Design an enzyme around this catalytic site. Structure first.
Site, PDB file in Angstrom:
ATOM      1  N   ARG A 248     -11.476  10.422  21.297  1.00 44.27           N
ATOM      2  CA  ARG A 248     -11.293   9.807  22.617  1.00 44.27           C
ATOM      3  C   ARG A 248     -12.598   9.364  23.245  1.00 44.27           C
ATOM      4  NH1 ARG A 248      -6.515  13.519  25.551  1.00 44.27           N
ATOM      5  NH2 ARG A 248      -5.129  13.512  23.743  1.00 44.27           N
TER       6      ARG A 248
ATOM      7  N   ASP B 291     -10.507  21.016  28.075  1.00 42.93           N
ATOM      8  CA  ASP B 291      -9.583  19.939  28.404  1.00 42.93           C
ATOM      9  C   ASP B 291     -10.296  18.600  28.238  1.00 42.93           C
ATOM     10  OD1 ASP B 291      -7.475  18.332  29.390  1.00 42.93           O
ATOM     11  OD2 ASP B 291      -7.805  18.934  31.460  1.00 42.93           O
TER      12      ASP B 291
HETATM   13  C1  LIG Z   1      -6.569  12.053   9.891  1.00 46.40           C
HETATM   14  C2  LIG Z   1      -5.454  11.983  10.943  1.00 46.40           C
HETATM   15  O1  LIG Z   1      -5.422  11.054  11.754  1.00 46.40           O
HETATM   16  N1  LIG Z   1      -4.545  12.972  10.931  1.00 46.40           N
HETATM   17  C3  LIG Z   1      -3.461  12.976  11.943  1.00 46.40           C
HETATM   18  C4  LIG Z   1      -3.129  14.407  12.344  1.00 46.40           C
HETATM   19  O2  LIG Z   1      -4.328  14.962  12.940  1.00 46.40           O
HETATM   20  C5  LIG Z   1      -4.553  16.367  12.897  1.00 46.40           C
HETATM   21  C6  LIG Z   1      -3.529  17.375  12.387  1.00 46.40           C
HETATM   22  O3  LIG Z   1      -5.649  16.791  13.302  1.00 46.40           O
HETATM   23  C7  LIG Z   1      -2.007  14.385  13.376  1.00 46.40           C
HETATM   24  O4  LIG Z   1      -2.475  13.734  14.611  1.00 46.40           O
HETATM   25  C8  LIG Z   1      -1.994  14.213  15.912  1.00 46.40           C
HETATM   26  O5  LIG Z   1      -2.830  15.346  16.230  1.00 46.40           O
HETATM   27  C9  LIG Z   1      -4.232  15.022  16.486  1.00 46.40           C
HETATM   28  C10 LIG Z   1      -4.971  16.309  16.872  1.00 46.40           C
HETATM   29  O6  LIG Z   1      -4.482  17.434  16.561  1.00 46.40           O
HETATM   30  O7  LIG Z   1      -6.048  16.236  17.539  1.00 46.40           O
HETATM   31  C11 LIG Z   1      -4.306  14.017  17.632  1.00 46.40           C
HETATM   32  O8  LIG Z   1      -3.683  14.626  18.817  1.00 46.40           O
HETATM   33  C12 LIG Z   1      -4.332  14.914  20.100  1.00 46.40           C
HETATM   34  O9  LIG Z   1      -4.295  13.644  20.774  1.00 46.40           O
HETATM   35  C13 LIG Z   1      -2.952  13.077  20.998  1.00 46.40           C
HETATM   36  C14 LIG Z   1      -3.071  11.733  21.670  1.00 46.40           C
HETATM   37  O10 LIG Z   1      -1.996  11.096  21.877  1.00 46.40           O
HETATM   38  O11 LIG Z   1      -4.224  11.260  21.939  1.00 46.40           O
HETATM   39  C15 LIG Z   1      -2.026  14.040  21.762  1.00 46.40           C
HETATM   40  O12 LIG Z   1      -2.369  14.197  23.183  1.00 46.40           O
HETATM   41  C16 LIG Z   1      -2.025  15.380  21.053  1.00 46.40           C
HETATM   42  O13 LIG Z   1      -1.322  16.294  21.817  1.00 46.40           O
HETATM   43  C17 LIG Z   1      -3.460  15.917  20.837  1.00 46.40           C
HETATM   44  N2  LIG Z   1      -3.405  17.155  20.041  1.00 46.40           N
HETATM   45  C18 LIG Z   1      -4.294  18.110  20.223  1.00 46.40           C
HETATM   46  C19 LIG Z   1      -4.101  19.346  19.333  1.00 46.40           C
HETATM   47  O14 LIG Z   1      -5.212  18.043  21.037  1.00 46.40           O
HETATM   48  C20 LIG Z   1      -3.530  12.750  17.237  1.00 46.40           C
HETATM   49  O15 LIG Z   1      -3.496  11.761  18.308  1.00 46.40           O
HETATM   50  C21 LIG Z   1      -4.351  10.673  18.324  1.00 46.40           C
HETATM   51  C22 LIG Z   1      -4.248   9.868  19.504  1.00 46.40           C
HETATM   52  O16 LIG Z   1      -5.173  10.420  17.395  1.00 46.40           O
HETATM   53  C23 LIG Z   1      -2.085  13.118  16.980  1.00 46.40           C
HETATM   54  N3  LIG Z   1      -1.320  11.932  16.562  1.00 46.40           N
HETATM   55  C24 LIG Z   1      -0.145  11.590  17.148  1.00 46.40           C
HETATM   56  C25 LIG Z   1       0.517  10.320  16.582  1.00 46.40           C
HETATM   57  O17 LIG Z   1       0.406  12.240  18.044  1.00 46.40           O
HETATM   58  C26 LIG Z   1      -0.778  13.677  12.738  1.00 46.40           C
HETATM   59  C27 LIG Z   1       0.431  13.678  13.701  1.00 46.40           C
HETATM   60  O18 LIG Z   1       1.026  12.602  13.968  1.00 46.40           O
HETATM   61  O19 LIG Z   1       0.840  14.756  14.196  1.00 46.40           O
HETATM   62  O20 LIG Z   1      -1.126  12.303  12.395  1.00 46.40           O
HETATM   63  C28 LIG Z   1      -2.207  12.208  11.429  1.00 46.40           C
HETATM   64  O21 LIG Z   1      -1.786  12.714  10.171  1.00 46.40           O
END
Ligand SMILES: CC(=O)N[C@@H]1[C@@H](OC(C)=O)[C@@H](O[C@H]2O[C@H](C(=O)O)[C@H](O[C@H]3O[C@H](C(=O)O)[C@H](O)[C@H](O)[C@H]3NC(C)=O)[C@H](OC(C)=O)[C@H]2NC(C)=O)[C@@H](C(=O)O)O[C@@H]1O
Length: 375
Positions: A205, A144
């Site tokens: 983060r 986490d």
């Molecule tokens: C290069 C790049 O930025 N690609 C991203 C995609 O990233 C991937 C598939 O790895 C994707 O981004 C989303 O998923 C990321 C991830 O899987 O780690 C991050 O998400 C984590 O953090 C967010 C957050 O807001 O901080 C949420 O809590 C998510 O639940 C969490 N996910 C997990 C599996 O832990 C990205 O967030 C951040 C803050 O960077 C998250 N982005 C968003 C806008 O939610 C993709 C997408 O939008 O799904 O965007 C890019 O292509």
């Protein structure tokens, strides 16, 4: 040192190192020493038993020997408590420390390694906690979180701490409502100082920060796999004298998979080649999508971006600058005195040497608006 008073030299030496928003913390000052003599999760002489005793009055907890403490559940730290692992090698395994509704807490010189065993946190500062100093910790491998400051908590300093080998490292406030600013009054009071920390071999983060007031100075971010820092949603941050170092061609050290609530997830190794250019997400990018989708129905007048003032940050190796000043007039000018060092490769070396649960001393080196005589 029959008691943890201002005349005890190791109490005085520690308290002399305080700075930042958590600088008022004295922990168990003026209370009783409790010496942990058992390394068990629970039982006589354990850390858990000491923390229960600490509910009764101020306590300064020390350890009789080097020990590994394999925890079955998270430890709860009450008010007016110091947990002090100096002079010993003390490691908490599989679980960590919760600082819930507590005031006046110092955590220093402890290792906490989750081993990805269960969904928990290494240091969770939450629910109206205040005046908390997290110092010379070594935090890793939490499925986490390594560290949160959230839910109406404030007046926190995180110093000289090594965050490593973990995915989602640090949240400064969270978001638990569809309306992104619903808890703004509650959480905007968060004031957190981060200095001389080392974020090494982490994913993301480092920190992710929203709503509150943050001062990040003289931290080293190195070899992150996805992104370094993130700010959004009217976080107000002074980000100065930090060092970002990364290389697009290096071996991945992440575990093969991460355990999650929805099952097993792939690692972030494929992002290594694009990580250096992501020293931070662009300002506001963490919540921009949600903000843009919800602003029609919610009518937000607060910014999706953070108010940032950036000064003297280094971008070494393949690392590239991202963050720029945005409404810097609204970023904090901390009211306190702090020991700022010019950002240099020599500073990065100092941080790698001393950040974490180390044996060497880190006394303060101080000018500024909050420094009487030395403005
Ligand atoms: C290069 C790049 O930025 N690609 C991203 C995609 O990233 C991937 C598939 O790895 C994707 O981004 C989303 O998923 C990321 C991830 O899987 O780690 C991050 O998400 C984590 O953090 C967010 C957050 O807001 O901080 C949420 O809590 C998510 O639940 C969490 N996910 C997990 C599996 O832990 C990205 O967030 C951040 C803050 O960077 C998250 N982005 C968003 C806008 O939610 C993709 C997408 O939008 O799904 O965007 C890019 O292509």
């Amino acid at each position: 040192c029959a008691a943890p008073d201002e005349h005890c030299p190791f109490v005085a030496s520690l308290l002399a190192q305080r700075e930042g928003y958590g600088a008022k913390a004295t922990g168990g000052l003026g209370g009783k020493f409790i010496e942990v003599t058992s390394d068990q999760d629970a039982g006589p002489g354990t850390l858990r038993a000491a923390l229960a005793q600490a509910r009764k009055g101020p306590a300064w907890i020390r350890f009789a020997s080097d020990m590994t403490i394999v925890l079955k559940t998270q430890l709860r730290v009450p008010s007016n408590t110091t947990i002090d692992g100096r002079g010993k090698r003390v490691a908490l395994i599989d679980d960590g420390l919760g600082v819930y509704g507590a005031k006046n807490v110092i955590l220093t010189h402890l290792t906490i390694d989750g081993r990805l065993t269960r969904l928990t946190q290494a240091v969770n500062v939450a629910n109206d906690s205040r005046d908390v100093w997290v110092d010379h910790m070594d935090l890793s491998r939490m499925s986490d979180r390594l560290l949160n400051v959230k839910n109406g908590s404030t007046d926190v300093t995180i110093s000289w701490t090594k965050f490593h080998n973990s995915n989602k490292v640090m949240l400064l406030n969270n978001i638990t409502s569809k309306n992104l600013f619903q808890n703004y009054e509650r959480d905007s009071i968060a004031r957190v100082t981060l200095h001389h920390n080392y974020f090494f071999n982490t994913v993301q983060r480092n920190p992710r920060a929203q709503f509150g007031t943050f001062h990040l100075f003289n931290n080293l971010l190195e070899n992150w796999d996805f992104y370094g820092m993130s700010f959004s949603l009217e976080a107000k941050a002074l980000v100065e004298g930090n060092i970002f170092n990364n290389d697009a061609q290096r071996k991945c050290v992440e575990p093969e998979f991460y355990p999650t609530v929805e099952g097993i997830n792939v690692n972030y190794c494929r992002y290594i080649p694009i990580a250096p250019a992501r020293s931070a997400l662009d300002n506001g990018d963490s919540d921009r999508g949600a903000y843009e989708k919800r602003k029609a129905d919610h009518g937000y007048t607060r910014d999706f971006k953070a108010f940032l003032r950036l000064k003297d940050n280094l971008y070494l190796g393949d690392a590239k600058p991202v963050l720029k000043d945005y409404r810097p007039e609204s970023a904090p000018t901390p009211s306190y005195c702090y020991g700022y060092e010019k950002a240099t490769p020599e500073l990065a070396e100092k941080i790698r040497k001393f950040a974490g649960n180390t044996s060497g001393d880190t006394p303060l080196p101080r000018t500024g608006a909050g420094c009487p005589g030395h403005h």
